[PDB]
Design a protein around this ligand. Structure first.
Ligand code: MG
Ligand code: MG
Ligand code: MG
Ligand code: MG
Ligand code: MG
Ligand code: MG
Ligand code: MG
Ligand code: MG
Ligand code: MG
Ligand code: MG
Ligand code: MG
Ligand code: MG
Ligand code: MG
Ligand code: MG
Ligand code: MG
Ligand code: MG
Ligand code: ZN
Lengths: 81, 103, 135, 71, 39, 74, 213
RNA sequence: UGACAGACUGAGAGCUCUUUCUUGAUUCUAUGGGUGGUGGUGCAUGGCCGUUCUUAGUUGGUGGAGCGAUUUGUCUGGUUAAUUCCGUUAACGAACGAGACCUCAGCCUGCUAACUAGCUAUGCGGAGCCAUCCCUCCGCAGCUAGCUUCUUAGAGGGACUAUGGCCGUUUAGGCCACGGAAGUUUGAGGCAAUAACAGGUCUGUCAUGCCCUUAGAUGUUCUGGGCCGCACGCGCGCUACACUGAUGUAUUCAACGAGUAUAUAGCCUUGGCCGACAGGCCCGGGUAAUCUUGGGAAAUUUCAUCGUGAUGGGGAUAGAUCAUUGCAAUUGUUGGUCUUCAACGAGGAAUGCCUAGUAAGCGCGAGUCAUCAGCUCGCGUUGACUACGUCCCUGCCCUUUGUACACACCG
């Protein structure tokens, strides 16, 4: 994966402000609603948060629901705040 | 003073719609409105034919679904403050109400 | 009057009517066309154009707001597509148009508010009396 | 193909046992009688039952009869 | 360039009324979307 | 309004007959209407009473209300 | 602006998308259904389940995440749709929760015949006119064979199937196959409407006794 | 990590190179494990469906018989669409299936209403007329209705074989006759049992075990071809072999349904103009009983023209051209125009469906759809011959009977 600090931050802000995140499977939109991303980056960094179990993931028929955990709030709190 | 308002109401269920419309109607008659309805409108019948097999063999057998949508309207000769004086009572399940201010 | 008479002889009277009741203009392609895409031959009639006019005249007599497309639709018909199943095919519209401009330039009809073509009060007079002059 | 089934026939026997002097022979009386002495969920079953109890009445009103017990 | 809202399959859709499901996903979710089958 | 062509003829017959009997029954007399009904029902009964027959829906597995696709074993 | 046909279809699709997504989320809470209510200035999602504080999380947090994800996913005006999550008054009748309970009991390692009657006698005591269970797949042998378990009455044809049978289907992920679980449960007539449906079965008659005076 | 100039490659893919800027710990490498697969196995499975099976059949609890598998209940007869009932009765009492239930259609001048539906009457307005008024057809609006027949859809009612007759253990019922809209359960469907089949589907699924593949990929994306290639066989259909017809005028009547912000009018498309046609340009209407469309459908109906002729039946085959959809029409998308005018003389052995608004004839809508409907699913229009039986053939259900069969006579 190749991602900027900027893109990491604009997702990290958004998760710490909301707590949930929703993707879609339809790929190459270049704009996921509510953030600025082409949906590869969100799906895959959130996958990596899943691998490190910072977010619980209920795939729910190709819509990628990611619920942040209090395990991950400490991570993000130690990242931006 | 007394304006002309319309109430557009539709649902999926016969009983439930007939209960809601009669509730609004007797509400109107309690306040002695100039009320005209409930005019019944023809029922729109969405239909689908689907081959009920999921693989495509055996006897070609289809199944038909139909959603009926029942359309109703009532005319009220009132002021909208009276309209919200009335139309705040319980609305029964599944029925849908979309009051419109007319000419 | 017009409703009181057989639906054919009114057209037979009226076809000779707007032949002999003065005359008018007539575009110079009347003799080639099939008058509808699905047709096969030009009409056998020599005075087919006048009978077209008479029929459309009573259409407008007894209805208001008939269009360039509605006249196409009411004169279309069955199209045998070859080995394919036959269907419905609308007739040609530019034949109907110049009929409408003939009856318009004669004042038999005129364009309608709200769209369409309505009979003219005096065109009504023309059709009613020509129908009264039938058996 | 008009044979009444067991539900119809045994409601017939039970109702005409349980209520005799409050039914009559004229069909159309019996319908409403049964509407007020019974609870059902299909007006066609209701007529189906009345149409059989009426000639059960016809046979009883002349002679004796099977199972039903009348005082 | 069109798939099910359900299973992401591009064959046998039911595009009428904007269901955007395939004929099988529509049977699978048929009676809860509200296609009560009187007949 | 509606129907086909012969269907409309057969509606006109019916509506003329039924309007006649209604008009006599309400405005001439019941007994005088009796002769009219007995003449009409003497000629036929379908002048006065509608026909319950309709087009019945076509069932899958063959074009036709009561037909089916042609069947092949081999 | 949208037509009413499209309106009703999209609302039905929303209902179904919830009914499904709320399952993977509320699997380990005993999900049974959701009702959507349209109110003035508000829309409501009535999750109904069998354990409520663990669907709430601690101090109503989990419902907060769920309401946020619904808001966001369906693009609702904020404060638009809110969740209540109540408890099914009776638990032996909602076949979804019983099938799910059989699912966890059967996943955990509990024996199949033990698991099915652990559902079955519960359904019998809890006031149901009958119950059927079918388990199908590869249980202790490769060749597929299906076991049926019963107790009490049951209907299978005609209209009152829809008004009396609460039936569920679930798939289980046992290693070396998948177990299909059908659970059919008969309801009983409650004219109140509270527990079983209101209109009784079309074959029941009540010959009233002849009050005497 | 991305890249400018050129080769390469079609490629304005920086893949690979000459050229060194750019970005900065996001990686790359290697060790496990993942992930993904319209990959395999439907014979490892779920699920759903089809079929056995459109028939009427199946199973416990207690009791009887038997050492036993099993049997009884579930039946000798009568009746039935029916394991539907009467009844007989080592059986008694119960569960599914059948029936009941649901939907559409048929009836109501009875009820609730309805200017998004619609008569009716009056007022004017047009046209004809013993004309001056009237009488007839028309259009417009209403504090016209002691309007709702027509239209819509709610609640109900109605039909139960009720009455009568004959047959019947005068039981279950059956046949007949008035009456009624309805007397095959009124018609048509929906749902539909136990046990199965090694029935179909891993090519519907982030349904799925096992196995194969995991970067030089069966992953994914792109360009092009392919599924459509034709000695030939088979299956469902379309068009015809004409005159009970073809072509050309005129005449006029449905129902089902269908219509995404579709962006700068945009799916259905009205009206006006341009156009021989295809089709274009303009101002519009409708998220719909409002606009399309009160759907002006054909077949059919009259008037001629063809006059038994492979003819003007028939319209395959091909040439030339235009237009629309599409980023793209070639292996002709489709629709026109003009031309070519092919085989087909009522069809061999055999075989399919069908018992009343049914077959057959006719068109329309919908799915598919950027465009392509000879199909499939629905709708209406015209509308019959024969039959009301039988076990002869092909089967299904039950009983007795015989069996050396049980993957069960395809033994
Ligand atoms: Mg198989
Ligand atoms: Mg299977
Ligand atoms: Mg025993
Ligand atoms: Mg013993
Ligand atoms: Mg026993
Ligand atoms: Mg029937
Ligand atoms: Mg192919
Ligand atoms: Mg076929
Ligand atoms: Mg003709
Ligand atoms: Mg020809
Ligand atoms: Mg045969
Ligand atoms: Mg189409
Ligand atoms: Mg022998
Ligand atoms: Mg022997
Ligand atoms: Mg042997
Ligand atoms: Mg042999
Ligand atoms: Zn799908």
């Amino acid at each position: 994966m190749i991602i900027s600090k900027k893109n990491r931050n604009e997702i990290c802000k958004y998760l710490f402000q909301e707590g949930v995140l929703y993707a879609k499977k339809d790929y190459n939109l270049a704009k996921h609603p509510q953030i600025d991303v082409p949906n590869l980056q969100v799906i895959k960094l959130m996958q990596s948060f899943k691998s490190k179990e910072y977010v619980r993931e209920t795939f729910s028929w190709q819509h990628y629901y990611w619920y942040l955990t209090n395990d991950g709030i400490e991570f993000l709190r130690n990242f931006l705040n | 003073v007394q304006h002309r308002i319309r109430i557009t109401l539709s649902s999926k269920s016969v009983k439930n719609l007939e209960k809601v419309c009669s509730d609004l109607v007797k509400g109107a008659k309690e306040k002695q409105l100039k009320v005209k309805g409930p005019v019944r409108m023809p029922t729109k019948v969405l239909n689908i034919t689907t081959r009920k097999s999921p693989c495509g063999e055996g006897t070609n057998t289809w199944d038909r679904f139909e959603m009926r949508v029942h359309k109703r309207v009532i005319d009220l000769v009132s002021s909208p403050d009276v309209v919200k004086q009335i139309t705040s009572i319980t609305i029964e399940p599944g029925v849908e109400v979309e009051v419109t201010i007319s000419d | 009057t017009v409703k009181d008479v057989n639906p054919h002889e009114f057209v037979k009277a009226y076809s000779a009517h707007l032949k002999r009741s003065g005359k008018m203009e007539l575009p110079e392609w009347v003799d080639i066309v099939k008058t509808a895409r699905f047709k096969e031959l030009p009409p056998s009639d020599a005075d087919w154009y006048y009978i077209r006019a008479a029929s459309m005249a009573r259409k407008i007599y007894l209805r208001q707001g008939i269009g360039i497309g509605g006249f196409q639709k009411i004169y279309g018909g069955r199209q045998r597509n070859g080995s394919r199943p036959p269907h419905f095919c609308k007739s040609s519209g530019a034949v109907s148009r110049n009929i409408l401009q003939e009856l318009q330039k004669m004042g038999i009809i005129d364009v309608d508010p709200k769209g369409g073509r309505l009979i003219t009060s005096q065109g009504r007079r023309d059709l009613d009396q020509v129908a009264g002059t039938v058996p | 193909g008009r044979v009444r089934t067991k539900t119809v026939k045994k409601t017939s026997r039970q109702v005409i046992e349980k209520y005799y002097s409050r039914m009559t022979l004229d069909f159309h009386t019996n319908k409403k009688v049964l509407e007020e002495v019974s609870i059902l969920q299909s007006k066609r079953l209701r007529n189906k039952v009345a149409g059989f109890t009426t000639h059960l009445m016809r046979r009883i009103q002349r002679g004796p009869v099977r199972g039903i017990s009348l005082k | 360039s069109r798939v099910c809202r359900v299973c992401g399959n591009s064959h046998g859709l039911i595009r009428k009324y904007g269901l955007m499901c395939c004929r099988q996903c529509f049977r699978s979710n048929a009676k809860d979307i509200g296609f009560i089958k009187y007949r | 309004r509606g129907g086909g062509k012969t269907s409309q003829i057969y509606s006109i017959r019916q509506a003329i007959a039924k309007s006649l009997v209604a008009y006599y029954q309400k405005y001439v007399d019941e007994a005088a209407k009796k002769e009219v009904k007995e003449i009409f029902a003497r000629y036929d009964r379908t002048l006065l009473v509608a026909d319950p027959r309709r087009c019945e829906p076509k069932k899958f597995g063959g074009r036709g209300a009561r037909a089916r696709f042609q069947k092949s074993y081999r | 602006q949208i037509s009413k046909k499209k309106k009703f279809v999209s609302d039905g699709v929303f209902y179904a998308e919830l009914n499904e997504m709320l399952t993977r989320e509320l699997a380990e809470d005993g999900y049974s259904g959701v009702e959507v209510r349209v109110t003035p200035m508000r829309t409501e999602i009535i999750i109904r389940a069998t354990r409520t504080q663990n669907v709430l999380g601690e101090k109503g947090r989990r419902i907060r995440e769920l309401t946020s994800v619904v808001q966001k996913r369906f693009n609702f005006l904020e404060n638009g749709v809110e969740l209540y999550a109540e408890k099914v008054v009776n638990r032996g009748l909602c076949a979804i929760a019983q099938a799910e309970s059989l699912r966890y009991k059967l996943l955990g390692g509990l024996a199949v015949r033990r698991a099915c009657y652990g559902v079955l006698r519960f359904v019998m005591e809890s006031g149901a006119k009958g119950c059927e269970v079918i388990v199908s797949g590869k249980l202790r042998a490769q060749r597929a064979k299906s076991m049926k378990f019963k107790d009490g009455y049951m209907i299978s044809s005609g209209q009152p199937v829809n008004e009396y049978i609460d039936a569920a289907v679930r798939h289980v992920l046992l290693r070396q196959g998948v177990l299909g679980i059908k659970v059919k449960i008969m309801l009983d007539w409650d004219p109140k409407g509270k527990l079983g449906p209101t209109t009784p079965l079309p074959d029941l008659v009540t010959i009233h006794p002849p009050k005497e005076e």
